[PDB]
Amino acid sequence: GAWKNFWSSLRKGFYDGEAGRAIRR
């Protein structure tokens, strides 16, 4: 058991703004 926390650990960075900033939309 760990992949679960690893999954959310990823979005943790996208929530900062990369979710859109990196999209250059």
Q: Quickly tell me which residue has 């979005």 as its tokens.
A: 11
Place of tokens 């926390």: 5
Work out how many domains the chain is built from and give that number. 1
Helices and strands, counts by H and E, the chain: 2, 0
**Short-list 25, 1, 22, CA closest to 11:** 22
Range of the domain at 25: 1-25
Q: What is d(CA 9, CA 24) in angstroms, rounded to the nearest whole number?
A: 23
Tokens standing for residue 18:
């990369």
